[PDB]
Amino acid sequence: LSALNPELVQAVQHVVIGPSSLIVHFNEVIGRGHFGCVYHGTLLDNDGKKIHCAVKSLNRITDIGEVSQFLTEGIIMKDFSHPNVLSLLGICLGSPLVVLPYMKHGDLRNFIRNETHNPTVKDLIGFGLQVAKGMKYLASKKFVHRDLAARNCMLDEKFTVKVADFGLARDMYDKEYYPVKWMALESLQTQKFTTKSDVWSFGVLLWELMTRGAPPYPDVNTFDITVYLLQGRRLLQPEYCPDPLYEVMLKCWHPKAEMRPSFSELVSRISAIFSTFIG
């Protein structure tokens, strides 16, 4: 660690959590191993307030080159915070640690699929509006997510949705062993991603919300999706999805990227749909 470049060490000081400020429960994993090496932890802020956090161990990092790159991703991610985006609490330098807020309800897809939970149509549109707000923020920063889906959004104790799976929180489902159906048509054809291809993914995420986590295009092979979309076939209107909300989804799947709504337009249109419900 003494081999680290000093101007880079100075640069990362506002992101670094001192080892005396973090208590990691290496004996308690979060999510039964489904999210890899992530543990319960306790972060002590400057005032001594105890913060329940999720601590990911980055075992895939060994050399000083990978360590430096990890410090930079930390510096960049610390500048991203919004109520609807998973916010980095900090980093710790065993293996390097990524400290994230604790999300009581885990991923959005498993929450809406859980038979014991009963989110209303209002609550579901509300989750889609929160995702649109988080994406509007990421898009304003010229950030292209590339993997927006309900599995990649987290839900906290106050039912606030956090767009995740970016920066140091990427490869969320990295399991140790012993997304073509969300992609825009041009991304399937050219392998190039833009904010307008994230708008497409957003439309598929809206459809996941309104069907309470059903898998998209279950009868279509991942190889056959391109042709299916070129024929002008699209995901159908879910049973209890309001028509103006389905109109919004169809706009997200326009074959011409330039004709799709912006995330700013999506927040505007969805906020007005959301306001029609009693609460």
Ligand SMILES: c1ccc(Cc2c[nH]c3ncc(-c4cnn(C5CCNCC5)c4)cc23)cc1
């Ligand atoms: C890297 C990047 C992002 C993560 C995601 C993550 C960050 N903070 C979390 N806080 C809690 C949980 C989580 C997982 N499952 N659960 C619950 C679900 C309801 N039943 C009890 C368990 C909570 C996940 C995360 C991980 C690694």
